[PDB]
């Protein structure tokens, strides 16, 4: 009974899904606001973790021989796209080739099956390039293409990490990126930019994300799932670019876009760089970002690091800095060595700036273990240049003084803050009214 | 005869630039926001009975709509009149 | 004990008398309204799981 499980449900629900998608592709040809994402969550929940290997009991090995001809496992794969089957069902023509592509890698057995993925991907490549030149008619095959192409060529980029580097992934997708751009965004533009940034960042290469900056703009219809990816990536660009403020802002924007608890790896990655970009501004991160369960024993070292940073004792930070370097490299953020070991003073002078309305240039040095006030004057001056501290400095009498605590409510500031929220709320209303009706 | 009779309800320009009364306007906002709170209190209950027993325009929704409309327009017009008076009259 | 409105400053050795503005109930009503809108927002979060 467990082996016949796909026959009871999966074989018929997948047929119903294909029929429904084709019907939407045939009637109500705007098959872009349909069940595609809602249904394709079934893929990750069930299908890629089921189609991976040539299972018997008609589960995988019996798919193609029963699906051999549709005129109203590679050798078995050749026939569903062959045998004079009707080809107007472009979603069917795409899916019949793309069905093993993601699961075949999801098997990850890596043995002679990497060749299978490596060739089944070029089968899809040939199908897509043949479809592109003929100017396919209006049946949303660009949408069906872009995402599955992104995933499958991501897997082929993993394979090109096993062997010769993944440059080919970029060069092709970039060419498709304009191809997607000149017609319309089928949500493919977002994922193509995301993969373009990912290919740059895997090489830690970054700067030629001149694409990411406004030379070409990111589309607004990224399903909140491409949004999180692109925002994390641009946060990582802006972080090392020494502009930590807007990076932290945009990536705090990004973090809330993740699901409840299913994106544990992505959540870990986002928090992993959010906490450090926050300490780069001297701000101690939030405690709740260390209390999520699956995130404790992963974010624990930087927690200890944070315990080291809320002191002037950078020697304590260094004493345990080398203790976990290899797990910093395994998590791909060890370049923290270049960007924390010297700015640790910034947080200390921050706390002083919070605690003291007025202080002496000697005193600021004493309680964060700095050597001489001649150094402390430069430290506080630097804090002013960065703008992290709103103080003022007067060496003539040894003064470091916070500016006047004026009442803000009797000024323009509350109106400005309320104007931002007015614009936000009216924008929410406008985009809400834009999208009621479709029947 | 049209707009000869209309001069009877015709608003005067001083009536247009009239700034109402700030104490009375504050009292009006005070009352309307409190009414908004009391409407939202049962609007919460109405949304928490979303379960669709015996599928049924009284109370929360449209009343909240008219309240927000009148409050927002009154506040906007008062602020605009005050601002115009501030900048134009000296 | 709030039985008297005024504020001390020892650094000048002085006490100060102020005007005690009347709390302006508008903002408290505002806070209750926005908190209850947060509650109804959680209610809609309970919805939309049916999609």
């Amino acid at each position: 009974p467990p082996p016949p499980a796909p026959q009871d449900v999966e074989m018929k629900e997948e047929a119903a899904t294909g029929g429904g998608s084709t019907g939407e592709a045939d009637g109500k040809t705007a098959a872009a606001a349909a069940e595609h994402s809602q249904r394709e969550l079934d893929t990750v929940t069930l299908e890629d973790i089921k189609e991976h290997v040539k299972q018997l009991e008609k589960a995988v090995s019996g798919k193609e021989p029963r699906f051999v001809l549709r005129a109203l496992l590679l050798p078995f794969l050749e026939e569903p796209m062959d045998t004079e089957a009707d080809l107007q069902f472009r979603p069917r023509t795409g899916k019949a080739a793309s069905t093993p592509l993601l699961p075949e890698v999801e098997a990850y057995l890596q043995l002679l099956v990497v060749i299978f993925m490596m060739n089944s991907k070029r089968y899809k490549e040939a199908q897509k390039i043949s479809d592109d030149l003929m100017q396919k008619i209006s049946t949303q095959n660009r949408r069906a293409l872009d995402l599955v192409a992104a995933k499958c060529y991501y897997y082929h980029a993993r394979v090109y990490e096993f062997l010769d580097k993944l440059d080919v992934v970029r060069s092709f997708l970039h060419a498709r990126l304009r191809t997607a751009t000149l017609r319309h965004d089928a949500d493919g533009q977002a994922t193509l930019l995301n993969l373009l940034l990912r290919n740059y960042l895997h090489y830690s290469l970054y700067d030629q994300a001149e694409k990411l900056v406004s030379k070409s703009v990111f589309p607004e219809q990224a399903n909140n799932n491409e949004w999180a990816r692109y925002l994390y990536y641009t946060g990582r660009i802006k972080a090392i670019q020494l502009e930590y403020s807007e990076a932290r802002r945009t990536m705090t924007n990004a973090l809330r876009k993740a699901p409840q608890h299913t994106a544990v790896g992505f959540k870990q990655t986002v928090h992993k760089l959010l906490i450090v970009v926050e300490l780069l501004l001297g701000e101690i991160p939030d405690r709740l970002q260390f209390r999520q369960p699956s995130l404790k024993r992963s974010l624990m070292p930087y927690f200890l690091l944070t315990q080291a940073v809320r002191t002037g004792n950078l020697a304590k930070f260094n004493q345990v800095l080398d203790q976990f370097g290899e797990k910093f490299q395994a998590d791909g953020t060890y370049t923290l060595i270049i960007r924390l070991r010297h700015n640790v003073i910034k947080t200390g002078v921050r706390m002083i700036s919070l605690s003291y309305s007025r202080i002496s240039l000697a005193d600021i040095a004493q309680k964060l273990q700095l050597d001489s006030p001649e150094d402390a004057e430069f430290i506080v001056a630097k804090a002013i240049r960065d703008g992290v501290i709103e103080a003022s400095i007067n060496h003539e009498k040894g003064y470091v003084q916070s500016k006047e605590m004026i009442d803000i409510y009797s000024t323009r500031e509350p109106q400005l803050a309320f104007h931002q929220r007015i614009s936000f709320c009216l924008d929410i209303h406008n985009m809400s009214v834009k999208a009621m009706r479709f029947p | 005869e049209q707009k000869m009779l209309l001069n009877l309800h015709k608003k005067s320009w001083m009536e247009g630039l009239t700034l109402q009364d700030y104490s009375e306007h504050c009292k009006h906002n005070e009352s309307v926001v409190k009414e908004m709170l009391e409407l939202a209190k049962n609007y919460n209950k109405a949304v928490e009975e979303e379960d669709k027993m015996t599928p049924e325009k009284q109370d929360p929704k449209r009343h909240l709509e008219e309240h927000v409309d009148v409050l927002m327009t009154s506040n906007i017009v008062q602020c605009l009149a005050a601002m115009l008076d501030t900048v134009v009259f000296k | 004990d709030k039985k008297f409105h005024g504020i001390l400053d020892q650094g000048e050795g002085v006490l100060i008398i102020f005007d005690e503005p009347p709390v302006d109930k508008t903002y408290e009503a505002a806070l209750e309204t926005i908190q209850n809108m947060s509650k109804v927002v959680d209610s809609l979060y309970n919805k939309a799981k049916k999609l």
Partner: peptide
């Protein structure tokens, strides 16, 4: 601010209910 925020909330509430209703009709039609 309060009025606009409440307007946005009610707008979202109409939007979600409209989506639910039309999706219910679509699911029943099949």
């Amino acid at each position: 601010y309060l009025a606009s925020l409440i307007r946005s909330v009610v707008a979202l509430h109409n939007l979600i209910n409209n989506k639910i209703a039309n999706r219910d009709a679509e699911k029943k039609e099949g």
